[PDB]
Amino acid sequence: DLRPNPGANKRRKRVGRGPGSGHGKTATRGHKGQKSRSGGLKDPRRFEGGRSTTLMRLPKRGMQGQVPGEIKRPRYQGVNLKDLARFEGEVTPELLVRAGLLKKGYRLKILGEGEAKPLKVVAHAFSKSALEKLKAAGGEPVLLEA
Amino acid sequence: RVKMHVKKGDTVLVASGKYKGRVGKVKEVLPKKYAVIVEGVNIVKKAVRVSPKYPQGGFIEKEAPLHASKVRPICPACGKPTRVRKKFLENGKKIRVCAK
Amino acid sequence: MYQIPVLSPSGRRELAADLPAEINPHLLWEVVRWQLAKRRRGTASTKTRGEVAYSGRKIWPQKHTGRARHGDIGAPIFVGGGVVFGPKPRDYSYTLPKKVRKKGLAMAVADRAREGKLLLVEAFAGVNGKTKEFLAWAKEAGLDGSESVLLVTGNELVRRAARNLPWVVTLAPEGLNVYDIVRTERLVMDLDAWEVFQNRIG
Amino acid sequence: PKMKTHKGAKKRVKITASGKVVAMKTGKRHLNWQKSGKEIRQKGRKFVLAKPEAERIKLLLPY
RNA sequence: AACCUGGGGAACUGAAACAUCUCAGUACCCAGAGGAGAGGAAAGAGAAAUCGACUCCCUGAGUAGCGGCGAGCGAAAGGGGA
RNA sequence: AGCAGCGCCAGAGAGGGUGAAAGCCCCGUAGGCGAAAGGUGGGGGGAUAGGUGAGGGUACCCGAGUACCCCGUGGUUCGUGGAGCCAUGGGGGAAUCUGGGCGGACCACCGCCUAAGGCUAAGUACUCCGGGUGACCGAUAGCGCACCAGUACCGUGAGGGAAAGGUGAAAAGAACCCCGGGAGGGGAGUGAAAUAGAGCCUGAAACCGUGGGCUUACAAGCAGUCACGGCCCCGCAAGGGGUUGUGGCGUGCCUAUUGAAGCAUGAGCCGGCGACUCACGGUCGUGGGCGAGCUUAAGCCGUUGAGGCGGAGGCGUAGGGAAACCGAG
């Protein structure tokens, strides 16, 4: 295999669409031809009409923020035991993030449905659901403390 | 600096163009333009007299400045490139196997 | 595939290779495009109608003059005045998934394998950096100059040798790239250099 | 560069797991007086928008 | 030349008007500094009985939050590196 | 220098010049040497300046119109907001560690910290300056300036601001003769080329002319176009071209518009310049790689067009709810 003919495997053609020509996208060039077509208009994303977007919908999301802001609070991480029962052993928060479900939320909350395992699953919070299925499996220690 | 070139006023061969093979004694190197002169190039200057002083100036066909890359020096052989060995004292040039 | 020729004093032996089976056209190309644009140097430069060394004055009145209508002699419709959408120094590079450069390096190397243009060597009896030495050596190994070759050893002396040769491109074992395996017709490298590529994927 | 989540948006809309923009019902906080119980209740709900709903999701996304 | 710190400090403009806001401490004026300048041994950071001068890059993060809660504005610790 | 015959160096086959296309002719290139002088320099060595201990008793000391409070303010993500903190214009005004600040009005507890003195390398920015390189420009481009340009020239002045590069391998730059006062030509000559003859390589279009073929002085027009005829022209032949007499038909271009040949817009003509780009972030689509995983950012090392390491972080796996919380609810 040589350098003649790697060629973007027939399907990616960079074929841009330069619209300054005589036939095709032309004259007005791109979808224009009218007016209010200079350096662009006001949005349209959210804003416009000149009436009231729809900013008529009203805030409810109170507790939106004082002036200090966000409070130092634990952040329990939900993770289905069915997603745990994959690998085996004595699973802990450590062994959990050490995989691909957590990303340092510190607090873990094994829960959900499926089939628990007869293993030990150290965690920061269970669900009354997981707790019992798991009692019907092996053991389970609560959190450490603070 | 480094304008120093192949050679000086002496016996030099010509592998140039129209004078390929002509060998003469080069009587003037002009480092300002990288061109020498032997007995080879000899275009006829039709002009009268170069400078107003003196009667007529002769149809002098005298040597014309040749480009130096078209001239190779020569000693007991037929013209080599110029390596340079050194003594216990000063330093001059020795060709591909000979001297001087 | 599994059949890679090995050159030694004990004679001719073979190794077993765990290189990739099926080769992916595109994938090997994307890897090259990357390689060929990360090295690209964003330099082409042009001046807008402001970076332009002109002054600003309204050239003439705009009203009752009879003449066209112009602001400054900088306007891009003017001549000499700033280009419109002129190329400005940029970074023609992107971050290609590492999981891909490999699958490329692995497919090129595995290509010459399937084309019999690979050669693993040990006995570099063409020692001490003297191209003369290398050329009486390549001979014994087959390399006649007909095919462009990629040399890849961690041995400077070995490098220096074929280093100036026109039909070969020298290289450290680390350098191996999904472009310079697709330049050469062949690929020769130290039994230690394949012991360090197969260390990355093998 | 790096668009800013329209702040005035998120302060009054939430986007659901599916992707439909849920919004708070308008018409309860001022017009009131004696609006039939059946009124101020059916207003306590949230709900869906439609085509502007898609304009909304355009204003966030980092969120 | 440009960059830097401090002293001063615009309006167009955007808000599809326009005052708060924006443009912005930008433009420019001034003074001073040097190959840099500034910054710097915590009356620090802020929730870990824990980090530990400063500077910069990456990130945190368009997050916390600020805003005729409109236009828009926009951090810090912590983590990664110099 | 090419084509060819046979050779050769390569730690050098980057590049450039040589009358064209040179690894080998030239300058270089790779490799390795070099400073009386000035400059630079903890990278190394040496020295100094300056620095190092416990317990106990005493109650001395520990940065003042400052802290702190209030009024007017700025900085900060903070626009007076529940408005702290740092900074300070105005007023009042401490304490020496059983002291003072801060932990977002405030109080209590508990923790952080030593204001009101000062200096500190490094990482950092920059590009007049020198060097390297370019999926940068190639004379209407690239700096305004390739050139005797911040000049000519315009403005009182601040200030503004051009155009203009090319013979040739070598001046070998046309002796002499001829017409002519000169300019300028005609021969001769140089040169491979002179229709490369000097603003001279290439020489396009508009535009101006000279010779020839066809054609026009009863003919009415967006100039073209069908049809036939005559003439002139290449061709054995059939045919092809040039022109255009007669008949038929025929409302320029763009733009702007309900509507244009329009007595609406714009263009004398030709040549050159001239307008949907780029960064970052989205949202589709698409081609791929990997997949309950996907992926690095800055950098570190390496390279001198060589990539690799770097999981910080990011998006994804659980949602609901204003939150506390709960959770396939």
Swiss-Prot record, chain A:
Residues 26-35 have a biased composition (Basic residues). GO terms for cellular component: cytosolic large ribosomal subunit. InterPro entries: Ribosomal_uL15, Ribosomal_uL15/eL18, Ribosomal_uL15/eL18_sf, Ribosomal_uL15_bac-type, Ribosomal_uL15_CS. The keyword Disulfide bond does not apply. Residues 1-56 are annotated as: Disordered. GO terms for biological process: translation. Residues 40-49 have a biased composition (Basic and acidic residues). Part of the 50S ribosomal subunit. Belongs to the universal ribosomal protein uL15 family. Binds to the 23S rRNA. This is Large ribosomal subunit protein uL15. It comes from Thermus thermophilus (strain ATCC BAA-163 / DSM 7039 / HB27).
Swiss-Prot record, chain B:
The keyword rRNA-binding applies. One of its GO terms (cellular component) is ribosome. The keyword Mitochondrion does not apply. Pfam families: KOW, ribosomal_L24. GO terms for molecular function: rRNA binding; structural constituent of ribosome. GO terms for biological process: translation. Keywords: Ribonucleoprotein, Ribosomal protein, RNA-binding, rRNA-binding. Belongs to the universal ribosomal protein uL24 family. Part of the 50S ribosomal subunit. One of two assembly initiator proteins, it binds directly to the 5'-end of the 23S rRNA, where it nucleates assembly of the 50S subunit. This is Large ribosomal subunit protein uL24. It comes from Thermus thermophilus (strain ATCC BAA-163 / DSM 7039 / HB27). The lineage of its organism: Bacteria, Thermotogati, Deinococcota, Deinococci, Thermales.
Curated annotation (Swiss-Prot), chain C:
One of the primary rRNA binding proteins, this protein initially binds near the 5'-end of the 23S rRNA. It is important during the early stages of 50S assembly. It makes multiple contacts with different domains of the 23S rRNA in the assembled 50S subunit and ribosome. This is Large ribosomal subunit protein uL4. The keyword Transport does not apply. Belongs to the universal ribosomal protein uL4 family. GO terms for molecular function: rRNA binding; structural constituent of ribosome. Keywords: Ribonucleoprotein, Ribosomal protein, RNA-binding, rRNA-binding. Transmembrane segments: none annotated. Part of the 50S ribosomal subunit. It comes from Thermus thermophilus (strain ATCC BAA-163 / DSM 7039 / HB27). InterPro entries: Ribosomal_uL4 (IPR002136), Ribosomal_uL4-like (IPR013005), Ribosomal_uL4_dom_sf (IPR023574). Pfam families: Ribosomal_L4. GO terms for biological process: translation. GO terms for cellular component: ribonucleoprotein complex; ribosome.
Swiss-Prot record, chain D:
GO terms for molecular function: structural constituent of ribosome. Disulfide bonds: none annotated. GO terms for biological process: translation. One of its GO terms (cellular component) is cytosolic large ribosomal subunit. SUPFAM superfamilies: L35p-like. Keywords: Ribonucleoprotein, Ribosomal protein. PROSITE patterns: RIBOSOMAL_L35 (PS00936). InterPro entries: Ribosomal_bL35, Ribosomal_bL35-like, Ribosomal_bL35_CS, Ribosomal_bL35_sf. Signal peptide: none annotated. Belongs to the bacterial ribosomal protein bL35 family. NCBIfam families: rpmI_bact (TIGR00001). This is Large ribosomal subunit protein bL35. It comes from Thermus thermophilus (strain ATCC BAA-163 / DSM 7039 / HB27).
